[PDB]
Design a protein around this ligand. Structure first.
Ligand SMILES: CC(C)(COP(=O)(O)OP(=O)(O)OC[C@H]1O[C@@H](n2cnc3c(N)ncnc32)[C@H](O)[C@@H]1OP(=O)(O)O)[C@@H](O)C(=O)NCCC(=O)NCCNC(=O)Cc1cc(O)cc(O)c1
Ligand SMILES: CC(C)(COP(=O)(O)OP(=O)(O)OC[C@H]1O[C@@H](n2cnc3c(N)ncnc32)[C@H](O)[C@@H]1OP(=O)(O)O)[C@@H](O)C(=O)NCCC(=O)NCCNC(=O)Cc1cc(O)cc(O)c1
Lengths: 415, 139
């Protein structure tokens, strides 16, 4: 074996040329070619080590699948207990400071790690279960929310009403452009919504926009913030992964709670039906989410796309779900050739449920929430998802994502 | 229209309040350019319009007509083209929409010409079979 230290000298060399060399941007050509070759031998080693020792590494970080740790926690714990395996807090810090164009791509290691972890029939279901458990900030504002009925947060605006946990994407500057802070307000909005006994149905829509091109009109989402992407503001873990293992997964299976409240034996997870309404447009992550709700509504002037095709990154868990919604044929016209389905064209019914004129969307929406109330819906919903997307299916997909995405991050053309 | 014909034929460009005519590659491109008001129709446009059509039809150098909307200046649509927002609801209340000089002149004037052409004078060989010069138009 002696795979460990092997891996270690590997991170060693890399650590070395990490100082000797000059800032990235002034190297040459055996300058670059050398650091680059280094990394490869290191990452190559990071893999072989984990292919045979992931479960161990995981067991040590979580006292043998006995302590649920969220993505951030797990990768951090990994860093200090296995230096060289994955970046440390500070190491990343150096990185985030630079612009996504000049980083050494240290996230790729987290990509190699998180991958091997989810690949195991033991560690993966656990890291997952762990990302389904209520988010602290959420358990923090729960009581206040239950008594108030209103939580105001930077990107999301939650509000309980008539038994509806209405969420409202309100980036009154930037068309709800996603960013790793929204992914936080979002996962908290979901949790609260799920744990509030007074909520029966969830609603996701876009608040009115302030920007001139859209002042006075709602907009669902403009995908990911292309800006922070170049600037080095999109975390592979704290955003891209936290997103698909965090809230988006909760919208499917619910919040894994603690054995406390009668029924846990049959429902360890609290789930509820959710309804998404589309105003203006759903581009990117905006569209991705529509493949996970129980009911999608959209004004006739809308359209949807993931039109990162020739240069952008992988559109989340779309590659995993769009298939079951519109076949492999369309699935690829959308994701591979960058096509967009207009709210009113026939093929829009593969993604949306109802399409009405914006000056009746409100009622279409209300009359919608009252139709998913009963506990009959909770059961049928839950079985339907068990069929559409299964545990192994999501795990396998999320595994390869962990890495694939990493690499797609630090790829010349996307940058 | 017969006034600005010769000038148009030699120029290839006529600039008018609401419409912007221009011959190119044998195309009489018209361009609805109310860079304030979304091409909102009004009995003055109905004038620039019927002249754009005539010139377009009588210019021997034109074979096909094109009707489109110029880029808009207004904030709700700055940098984007808009075809037309119908009639100017404003002048309608204000008493600016002529039953004759606009509503009728419109349907008996240019819109009819886009169908049957410009009735010309017995002058030019062929009048016996084509007293009217028509051409295909693309919107
Ligand atoms: C939506 C648009 C077509 C609107 O066109 P317009 O009417 O021309 O409005 P604009 O003037 O361009 O923009 C209005 C306003 O919003 C801002 N805006 C619009 N889109 C964005 C984005 N994406 N980020 C930040 N700010 C934005 C824009 O900068 C403007 O403010 P100013 O720059 O100061 O003028 C345009 O904004 C646009 O093309 N955005 C590109 C949309 C895009 O490509 N998003 C990429 C999506 N790619 C992903 O989501 C990838 C992804 C996301 C995930 O969540 C997970 C995952 O795994 C992968
Ligand atoms: C097109 C719209 C939906 C655009 O909505 P928005 O994106 O909300 O833009 P707005 O802010 O409302 O308008 C942008 C801008 O264009 C101006 N605008 C828009 N439409 C018009 C019209 N119709 N006239 C004048 N100005 C207009 C509008 O006043 C704004 O400038 P400001 O008032 O200073 O803000 C709106 O402008 C609108 O509803 N217009 C009403 C359109 C309409 O009903 N036209 C009526 C058509 N009725 C006929 O054509 C009748 C007719 C016509 C004929 O030619 C022949 C005939 O026999 C019969």
């Amino acid at each position: 074996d002696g795979l460990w230290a092997a891996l270690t000298e590997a991170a060693a060399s890399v650590e070395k040329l990490l100082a000797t060399l000059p800032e990235h941007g002034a190297r040459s050509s055996a300058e670059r070619a050398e650091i680059a070759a280094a990394h490869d031998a290191a990452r190559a080693l990071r893999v072989r080590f984990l292919d045979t020792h992931a479960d161990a590494v995981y067991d040590r970080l979580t006292d043998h699948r006995r302590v649920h740790l969220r993505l951030a926690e797990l990768v951090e714990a990994a860093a200090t207990a296995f230096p060289g395996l994955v970046p440390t807090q500070q190491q990343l810090a150096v990185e985030r400071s630079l612009p996504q164009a000049a980083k050494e791509g240290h996230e790729i290691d987290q990509g190699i790690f998180l991958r091997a972890v989810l690949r195991s029939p033991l560690a993966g279901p656990h890291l997952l279960d762990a990302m389904l458990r209520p988010t602290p900030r959420a358990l923090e504002l729960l009581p206040e929310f239950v008594r108030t009925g209103e939580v105001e947060m930077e990107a999301v605006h939650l509000e309980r009403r008539d038994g509806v946990a209405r969420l409202t994407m309100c980036r009154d500057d930037r068309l709800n452009a996603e960013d790793g802070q929204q992914v936080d307000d979002m996962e908290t909005a979901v949790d609260l919504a799920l744990l509030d006994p007074g909520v029966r149905v969830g609603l996701l829509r876009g608040g009115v926009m302030s920007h001139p091109r859209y002042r006075g009109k709602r907009v669902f989402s403009a995908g990911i913030n292309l800006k922070y992407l170049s600037q080095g503001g999109i975390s592979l873990v704290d955003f891209l992964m936290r997103k698909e293992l965090g809230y988006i997964h909760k919208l499917v299976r619910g919040v894994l709670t603690n054995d406390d409240r009668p029924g846990w034996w049959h429902s360890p997870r609290i789930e509820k039906p959710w309804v998404a309404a589309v105003d203006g447009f759903a581009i990117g992550g905006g569209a991705q989410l529509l493949l996970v709700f129980d009911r999608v509504l959209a004004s006739s002037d809308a359209y949807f796309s993931l039109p990162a095709a020739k240069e952008g990154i992988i559109p989340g868990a779309a590659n995993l779900r769009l298939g079951r919604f519109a076949g492999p044929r369309v699935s690829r016209q959308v994701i591979l050739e960058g096509r967009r389905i207009w709210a009113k064209e026939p093929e829009a019914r593969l993604l949306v449920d109802e399409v009405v004129e914006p000056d009746e969307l409100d009622a279409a929406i209300e009359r919608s929430l009252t139709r998913l109330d009963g506990d009959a819906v909770l059961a049928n919903r839950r079985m339907l998802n068990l069929a559409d997307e299964s545990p192994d299916g999501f795990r396998a997909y999320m595994a390869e994502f962990a890495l694939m995405q990493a690499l797609r991050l630090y790829g010349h053309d996307v940058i």
